[PDB]
Amino acid sequence: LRVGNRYRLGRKIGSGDIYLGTDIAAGEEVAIKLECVKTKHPQLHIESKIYKMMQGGVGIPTIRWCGAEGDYNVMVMELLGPSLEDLFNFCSRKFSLKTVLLLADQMISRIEYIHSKNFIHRDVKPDNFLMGLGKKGNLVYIIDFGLAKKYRDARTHQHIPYRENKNLTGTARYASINTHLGIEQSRRDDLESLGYVLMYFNLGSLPWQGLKAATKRQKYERISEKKMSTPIEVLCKGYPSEFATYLNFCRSLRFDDKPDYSYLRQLFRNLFHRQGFSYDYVFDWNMLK
Ligand SMILES: Fc1ccc(-c2ncn(C3CCCCC3)c2-c2ccnc3[nH]ccc23)cc1
């Protein structure tokens, strides 16, 4: 079907829904996200506004086209490759220290860029980072701005107020302690969540993963409690101290503190150099044959 002037829609990729497509005119594959014009909760146009504000940043996917066609609102992106969850599954849920550290360097940089554009992400998880294709295959991208919010006024740089008594909107596995306590999310929270993602890659799972409970809200209570009763030195036992030092620093941040991103990158860089690794972008999955 003839989306825009110059895009052919293909079959679904996964999860509105995501499709493979072709830029017929340029001879490139693309990713297409459709949303029905009458949902109860229209979101794509809002998301697209944010993706547009992010454009030009390293590892932000490039919008080809937004519009509407027939029954649908439409956004078209340059094609990207598999997520970190997909590549983690493909690697038997085991990443080397070198791979974790290569990813951590880029991942901190993307969150910092988002924050520079006056937003917080609030769904930092392996599924929302994708590797590029082709020439861009060494580059980690971030996606999914459906849960994102402005944390300061674009002009006045005025932080949003400290609020309580909130819901847990994102993914519970990687959520911050302050999020479980129902406190308003800020920059520190995106970074703490990254901290849990990194240990996830180290361990193959997290200790509060796979808790049975009867209801959903009961399951979140159980995750919260497990997190809050698992000291950082226990979570990180048997891995370089840097993972612990990073999570402790994140948990020390005040609501409206600007994180020292540079310090966090330097932490993992120094570890990287002590191990004698080279920044040559050869991830575990590149060595498959
Ligand atoms: F305009 C957009 C087009 C696609 C997407 C998207 N959402 C989710 N994904 C993937 C689907 C496969 C599982 C992992 C998440 C995409 C997506 C898929 C492929 N290459 C892409 N390039 C940019 C986003 C995206 C988001 C906005």
Alpha carbon of 221 to ligand 1 centroid (Å): 31
Cβ(44) to ligand 1 under 6 A?
Answer: no
Considering the domain architecture, whether residues 62 and 13 belong to the same structural domain is answered as: yes
Considering the domain architecture, whether residues 140 and 278 belong to the same structural domain is answered as: yes
- In three-state form (DSSP H/G/I as H, E/B as E, the rest C), the secondary structure along 203-262 is HCCCCCCCCCCCCHHHHHHHHHHHHHCCCHHHHCCCCCCHHHHHHHHHHHCCCCCCCCHH
Give the CATH number for residue 19: 3.30.200.20
Cβ(61) to ligand 1 under 6 A?
Answer: yes
User: Closest residue (by CA) to atom 17 of ligand 1?
Assistant: 31
Alpha carbon of 167 to ligand 1 centroid (Å): 26
The minimum-distance atom of ligand 1 relative to the CA of 47 is 27
Give the CATH number for residue 142: 1.10.510.10
Cβ(223) to ligand 1 under 6 A?
Answer: no
Domain closes at, from 78, 112, 127: 78
Beta bridge partners of 75: 33, 66
Considering the domain architecture, whether residues 41 and 135 belong to the same structural domain is answered as: no
Half-sphere exposure of 266 (CA within 13 A, CB side): 4
Considering the domain architecture, whether residues 110 and 13 belong to the same structural domain is answered as: no
Considering the domain architecture, whether residues 7 and 112 belong to the same structural domain is answered as: no
Residue 150 assigned ligand-binding role: no
The minimum-distance atom of ligand 1 relative to the CA of 76 is 1
Considering the domain architecture, whether residues 199 and 95 belong to the same structural domain is answered as: yes
Alpha carbon of 33 to ligand 1 centroid (Å): 7
Domain closes at, from 78, 107, 133: 78
Q: What is the number of domains present in the chain?
A: 2
Q: Which residue among 18, 76, 86, 133 is best mutated to probe the pocket of ligand 1, counting the most ligand atoms within 8 A of its Cβ?
A: 18
Cβ(66) to ligand 1 under 6 A?
Answer: no
Domain closes at, from 27, 51, 78: 78
Considering the domain architecture, whether residues 229 and 270 belong to the same structural domain is answered as: yes
Alpha carbon of 17 to ligand 1 centroid (Å): 9
User: How far, in Å, CA of 38 to CA of 15, rounded?
Assistant: 19
DSSP output for the chain: -EETTTEEEEEEEE---EEEEEETTTTEEEEEEEEESS-SS--HHHHHHHHHHHTTSTTPPPEEEEEEETTEEEEEEE----BHHHHHHHTTT---HHHHHHHHHHHHHHHHHHHHTTEE-S--SGGGEEE--GGGTT-EEE---TT-EESB-TTT--BPPP--S----S-TTT--HHHHTTPPP-HHHHHHHHHHHHHHHHHSS-TTTT---SSHHHHHHHHHHHHHTS-HHHHTTTS-THHHHHHHHHHH--TT----HHHHHHHHHHHHHHTT---S---GGGG--
Considering the domain architecture, whether residues 163 and 252 belong to the same structural domain is answered as: yes
Considering the domain architecture, whether residues 94 and 155 belong to the same structural domain is answered as: yes
Residue 143 assigned ligand-binding role: no
Give the domain extent around 181: 82-286
Cβ(33) to ligand 1 under 6 A?
Answer: yes
Cβ(3) to ligand 1 under 6 A?
Answer: no
Considering the domain architecture, whether residues 216 and 275 belong to the same structural domain is answered as: yes
Q: Resolution, in Å, please? A: 2.4
Considering the domain architecture, whether residues 42 and 112 belong to the same structural domain is answered as: no
Considering the domain architecture, whether residues 28 and 64 belong to the same structural domain is answered as: yes
